[PDB]
Design a protein around this ligand. Sequence first.
Ligand code: SF4
Ligand code: F3S
Ligand SMILES: [Cl-]
Ligand SMILES: [Mg+2]
Lengths: 598, 265
Amino acid sequence: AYATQGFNLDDRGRRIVVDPVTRIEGHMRCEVNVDANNVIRNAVSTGTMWRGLEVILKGRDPRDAWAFVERICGVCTGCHALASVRAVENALDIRIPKNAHLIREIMAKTLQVHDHAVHFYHLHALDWVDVMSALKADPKRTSELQQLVSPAHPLSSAGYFRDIQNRLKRFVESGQLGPFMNGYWGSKAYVLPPEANLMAVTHYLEALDLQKEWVKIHTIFGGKNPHPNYLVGGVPCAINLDAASAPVNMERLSFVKARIDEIIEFNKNVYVPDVLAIGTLYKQAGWLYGGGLAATNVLDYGEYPNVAYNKSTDQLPGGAILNGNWDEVFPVDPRDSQQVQEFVSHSWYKYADESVGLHPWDGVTEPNYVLGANTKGTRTRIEQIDESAKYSWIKSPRWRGHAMEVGPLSRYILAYAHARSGNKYAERPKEQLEYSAQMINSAIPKALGLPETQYTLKQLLPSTIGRTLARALESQYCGEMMHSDWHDLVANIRAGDTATANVDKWDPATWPLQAKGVGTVAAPRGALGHWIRIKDGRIENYQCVVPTTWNGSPRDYKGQIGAFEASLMNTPMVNPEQPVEILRTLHSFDPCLACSTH
Amino acid sequence: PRTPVLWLHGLECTCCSESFIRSAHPLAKDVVLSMISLDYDDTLMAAAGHQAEAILEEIMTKYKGNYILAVEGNPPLNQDGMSCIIGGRPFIEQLKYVAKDAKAIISWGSCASWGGVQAAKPNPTQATPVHKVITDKPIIKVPGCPPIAEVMTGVITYMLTFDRIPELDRQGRPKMFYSQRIHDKCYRRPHFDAGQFVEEWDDESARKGFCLYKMGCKGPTTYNACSTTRWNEGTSFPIQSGHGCIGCSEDGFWDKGSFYDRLTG
Ligand code: SF4
Ligand code: F3S
Ligand SMILES: [Cl-]
Ligand SMILES: [Mg+2]
């Protein structure tokens, strides 16, 4: 046992293993220890995959890099491609034209919406929603609940709900439950009434059909989804209005606009109201666990400047907060070797000296799969991982030595803090948060006949409910932003600027013989960075630090825990053999393990 | 009853799963509810850990030699196989166990089919495609990074309807989707035929949709349905949106030179 970051880690209680963690991207193992009362008193995050993209990139052409690193992940598809082209453009001092900037922003914001919404309904919702309980909802009461939760949502009639319910019924009555097989249904960890469950499962199915429409924005600008194409110097989708032979004409842009408007409708009428309502009911049940590091330390690089290449105009303004002090946002510099560093003390890698963290321009990725002496089982059959030694394929990123949480919650806490200091570019997220607090505290309880609470944003946000909430609000905000981006794009084209690529430094003969660059992206899951070194036209070093690398990190040299492990701490389990609470909180980070390890 | 599909994930980026749910005809929703029984799949399944792994032996016993094994991603042979761990054991052990009683095996995507990005030089994990590991079972390869959504569900639909693997070419790909090169029916072909090429990004030629061969388009050596079926309910495809085919469905395309180096012959 030892104490760190205000958490009392104790590994003396009953050990529970969750391998595999399902409803995530990629491969994860989680181990916890629970005390005599089923409270988690220790948590162990193990990334159980590695592919070695950073090794694979060495010696290749920087212009090709985006396509390789895009295949780090098909879920956060395109964010690595964006980071890569930004990194190369940074190294080579290339400025992209305005249309390329706007198209990349639209593509980025499309990913945010698609990623966030699919995660909540298809990965996260079954931690809050009991599908078997939905089988007993009154279709009328469900229609009634729908009208209260989101008055504007057109799909609300009673007949529509018994239609959905009956298809589920005979699906379940078939005896082949498919993805619902061996679920944890009926657990007391579920608190929603039948009506809420049916409403949510209905939206699960609605979202599954709709999500495929949203990505057609990627298809237009980038050819395909998953894995749309990108370009060093701009975008490949050349523009011509007067035309049907160019990649982008006014008809294609009208199509993009129609999809954006559908997105804004879904966020406002389905996604945000569901999360507000589900969040309210679990708040009523007292389930405010899972805050972890969000209560103290949060980080983002900052993103979405309304004036290109001017970081002070970031609409999700970033930086770092420490020790729960929301009055002081520290600036974060991705170039500073004393800020972002990665340790491998407890990771399956080796450094020359593992008592230090390496800034990614000096990063090293050399595999070292070795298990500690206190392991139960063998090298090829682990029964209990030994967290006192190396226990993950994920490196341990820290900022000035501090363990940080990254993600939509971090960005929203940071935006809130910025707004209080006078930053007007963060006004909308602040408005969203205060609207949400008032809905969760007063408005929704009043509509549902529940007692009204008085939680502040400081109390409500650092929680699994808060983390889930911020993801939904970010989706809504991203939809609103790309709606404005579309107008700016069309206006710029109509003013006469059709440029989409800067090719002045496309040829390697124009490059400096040595160069380094960094590209950062506010990816769906948090702070993403790619750091590159170029020598004689080839990649000398390529290092990625990815959002789930931050969140899922194992312990560092000082033994400080990362966001996953901190968030599981101090959480009671209804049944220690059913990982319902573990999944609910882990899933609230939207873990992408392929991303985390690359 | 609906045919059980056990969908395993090795070393992967999860693009084939994502592409699968983009399918319009049929909808993934209808595939899952009305066509197959998706009993194991890490990305969607309710159960985790011990409860998740228990599903495998239950389905294999009950539907022995009558379930489809779908494999996304691939097994590593370096690090004693523990660069991909599932239930404390190498993935290659899970793959071999589930494969022995499958009536058919689908290699989803270029990772499973050929090795994928992780198998590109120097391949630090020794990622190995499924057919080099499973040698005594009929495998259909559905390559592409990812494959087109309708190609994936098209393969499933054929197998469910006829209870047979569709006719395959020499490389184990279904001829119904992989018999044409992109170049055969690419709408920029008339520009290629008249020697009309893009030479620089966003030049006049690019704004007129000229052929992308000189920008490195690998459509002439790449077999897939991209120029006909196209992507995301026929919305576009790489070439239509202005970037050349990078050859993503072909074996070892990562190590066939820069994507922007043109073919010679
Ligand atoms: S763009 Fe590519 S596939 Fe189309 S005609 Fe030119 S070379 Fe052939
Ligand atoms: S890059 Fe791939 S998606 Fe098609 S156009 Fe080429 S085979
Ligand atoms: Cl490949
Ligand atoms: Mg890294």
